């Protein structure tokens with residue numbers, strides 16, 4: 001039986017003894033069958049998840065509300081009296097109400113737990129001698145885990161290989177300085193504090209630099225500080241500010257409703273009316289007017305938006321970011337990953353002498369050739385191009401195999417061009433001795449390699465990079481084999497050629513070589529191509545046209561970036577560009593007045609990205625920046641809508657950013673805006689419908705009380721109307737697919753409220769129309785002195801039909817009834833049908849007849865009510881149509 005090794009003992013114990021105890025193969029990894037056995041015995045590589053879900057507890061918690069308690073008290077006091085039919089009716093009504101509330105809460109909790117836990121932790125592991133790609137959830141104590149830069153440590157590792165490792169342990173230790181890691185055993189005297197353990201990698205820490213490979217010593221709860229981990233991250237309350245605003249609005253509406261109910265009670269009691277019946281009616285109205293489904297529906301619509309985002313490759317965490325996601329003003333993205341595909345090929349070759357050579361072929365394939373202006377070259381014919389491809393081979397770091405690329409796209413394109421000429425065998429012929437790492441701030445890499453067949457000649461350097469960083473280190477050039485020196489008369493024409501290459505759609509680079517890396521010989525430039533991704537130009541145009549001001553932050557040259565922006569809709573006739581030196585000269589103040597006028601940035605850095613973020617946030621704008629680097633993590637954290645990458649993004653940037661895309665494309669941002677605006681529109685629909693229904697009911701009750709005639713609503717019918725107003729139909733209205741025409745609207749403001757003048761006017765119009773219809777029904781209904789329950793049933797049916805028709809036309813503030821389709825959201829149709837059958841059963845069920853005192857009606861009366869109750873829908877449709885037509889005509893003219 002394998003024992004679990006503690007962190008301190010693993011640090012104390014030698015690596016070989018540790019591997020002996022865990023029976024782990026450091027080279028070939030661990031086999032799958034033993035992986036399954038260890039997983040079965042030790043559980044999975046997860047945190048022990050346990051919580052109380054005693055459904056009877058949440059059933060009881062649905063009770064104890066003051067409204068339900070008062071209803072139960074009224075039921076008890078009626079039981080104490082001589083009446084029992086009212087008591088049984090009220091208790092079955094409150095039972096239906098609490099069951100509806102229970103299913104609403106259950107659905108809300110269900111959506112809550114389908115939310116989150118959607119980005120599993122993923123890390124490398126060695127099994128059966130192969131580096132295989134598993135989730136961290138699959139780990140067992142004994143596997144060999146490879147750690148890379150930017151990867152999050154999945155479990156406690158006993159490090160045995162490490163070259164210049166720095167691990168950010170600020171999360172678990174609080175030290176802002178990453179801790180260097182070693183592999184030697186640690187002394188017992190220094191094994192006291194956590195930070196002194198320099199040979200163990202802890203789960204949840206981020207690797208900042210270096211390479212590593214260790215064996216898991218702990219999984220799940222046995223891991224050190226796992227206790228404090230489940231202490232902090234297990235429970236949290238990240239309340240969305242939109243939820244707070246909705247709660248405040250609901251509380252204000254509830255206070256106003258309570259004031260209205262109190263005024264109505266005072267007026268009725270001062271007028272000498274009923275006591276118990278009026279009290280029950282008032283308490284039913286109070287429980288009706290309270291918006292209780294608003295938080296449930298907002299959680300449901302947030303979860304639905306997140307799920308719809310995920311269904312089409314848009315993973316969004318950090319729930320309250322979605323609320324401000326729709327209020328997007330400025331969008332920034334790179335140019336190699338999000339706008340154009342990462343498929344680079346070289347189609348132009350330029351040398352020191354000057355010969356326009358064109359290269360054909362698309363992709364990393366060997367079908368292709370180099371075409372000078374009339375020649376046939378398949379070998380050592382032109383010395384300049386041969387030297388260029390040889391330098392490309394020497395400076396190359398990646399390796400191409402079976403038409404596959406594993407490395408940076410630029411080196412892949414260079415090696416593909418080299419293989420096209422037939423010199424693929426020179427990549428491994430030269431062996432590097434001194435290596436110069438390539439960096440964003442450096443923009444050039446150098447190698448020191450010599451031929452192995454002969455070593456009489458001294459060392460020769462081969463380096464490539466940007467032209468601005470190449471001509472500075474190069475003052476010699478070749479014409480016909482011999483070495484000469486360049487002057488200004490060649491630098492100017494080289495600059496013109498660089499600009500010409502940067503035009504159209506080509507990328508500009510430079511090749512240099514020499515004996516010592518202080519004086520080289522210029523070779524020429526390579527015309528790497530970069531085709532834009534399909535369906536990006538129209539997306540960019542339709543984004544910038546409406547309300548967005550997308551900018552460009554790319555590391556290319558001036559001409560290349562300008563041409564790429566001109567191909568899309570980013571560049572205009574009034575836009576400028578800021579260089580890296582210029583953006584470094586000014587920190588915040590001088591950059592503020594120029595950021596809204598520049599859409600293309602020169603070769604920048606993560607520090608420059610931070611500067612742009614600070615300048616944009618100073619002006620008061622929302623920025624959505626996408627990054628794929630370790631040093632872009634701070635930029636993503638500072639940005640409110642920072643986006644990470646799935647395939648080209650590290651784990652550090654994945655965790656730091658609030659949005660992760662499994663595919664790099666400039667199409668999910670419009671999708672983010674569309675779902676955000678759609679869920680906002682659904683919330684507006686719910687709010688408008690609930691407010692209109694509540695206002696109509698309260699106005700009808702107030703007019704009934706003030707005019708001194710019995711109210712044709714009772715209490716059970718009021719409870720049914722309440723269930724309709726915030727229940728299955730209200731949630732059906734809240735659940736709605738995103739409208740196609742929702743992107744042609746200026747971005748929303750974060751400080752804007754939910755109630756507008758148009759919404760208030762529509763609510764008032766609908767309420768007054770419903771009230772007028774009910775008054776007309778009553779006037780045509782009571783033409784004598786005899787009052788029957790049939791009249792009350794007819795009034796209740798008219799009110800139900802009016803509410804249903806209002807909900808029918810409340811699913812679109814701008815679209816018509818037939819524009820979205822009669823059957824688009826099947827949930828709404830199902831709810832309407834269920835309400836219809838429930839009303840019919842209430843009318844025609846002897847038990848429900850006794851409960852609801854509905855008596856009976858006729859087919860002709862029902863048809864007349866249906867014909868009359870359609871007034872709200874037609875009026876709303878015509879006013880919406882005329883308003884939309886007038887707005888479109890005015891904006892067109």
Ligand SMILES: Nc1ncnc2c1ncn2[C@@H]1O[C@H](COP(=O)(O)OP(=O)(O)CP(=O)(O)O)[C@@H](O)[C@H]1O
Nearest residue numbers: 334335336410440443444445464465466554555556
């Ligand atoms: N393998 C390589 N060797 C030498 N230079 C390289 C290189 N890859 C890129 N460069 C140089 O680095 C410069 C800027 O590159 P950087 O990596 O900062 O951004 P980038 O090339 O990835 C474009 P972007 O950031 O918009 O995706 C380019 O002009 C290029 O000349």
Ligand SMILES: [Ca+2]
Nearest residue numbers: 287288289290
């Ligand atoms: Ca209510």
Ligand SMILES: [Mg+2]
Nearest residue numbers: 334553554555
């Ligand atoms: Mg970049």
